[PDB]
Design a binder for these strands. Structure first.
Ligand SMILES: [Zn+2]
Ligand SMILES: [Zn+2]
Ligand SMILES: [Zn+2]
Ligand SMILES: [Zn+2]
Lengths: 74, 79
DNA sequence: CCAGAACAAAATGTTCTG
DNA sequence: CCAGAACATTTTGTTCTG
């Protein structure tokens, strides 16, 4: 397709198994490797789009996983 | 009290007219000196505590405004 | 073309100085 | 005590290298 499946910015290729942009790729790797235990400040349903992808690591990461991102993709 | 009224961290003094920590103080000064065209990803009531104050500058700024913060606070107090 | 590194920028937080 | 500044860290994002 065309746009990132996590944040709807334009995607840069298939990363960790899913079409995504560069920032989401590294965010996802950092999230998993850092074990940050992110906590949403709203209702676990934050809108994650181009401007607001910084707004909630908990929801962004959740949206990553739901899109099927995984580190040992291939 | 001595906890920040914006985020409930340890307040460090009365800054721009309200008990706040140093981080909220400078966050507000910066929001006020420049642009604060932020956008909330939830429902404009995000919970602002020590860790999550980073998540939503839109709501963090709102809770500063709502607490009465203003730059001329200290000068107005001397009047 | 992609993962991870390395570099860079944005955003946040702390100590210094008037 | 508290303002702004200066210094410092964190967080996110882009380009480079394997
Ligand atoms: Zn993305
Ligand atoms: Zn959220
Ligand atoms: Zn605070
Ligand atoms: Zn918010």
């Amino acid at each position: 397709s065309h746009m990132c499946l996590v944040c709807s910015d334009e995607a840069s290729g298939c990363h960790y198994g899913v079409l995504t942009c560069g920032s989401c790729k590294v965010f996802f790797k950092r999230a998993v490797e850092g074990q940050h235990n992110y906590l949403c400040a709203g209702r676990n349903d934050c809108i994650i789009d181009k401007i607001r992808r910084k707004n909630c690591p908990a929801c962004r990461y959740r949206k990553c996983l739901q899109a099927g991102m995984n580190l040992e993709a291939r």
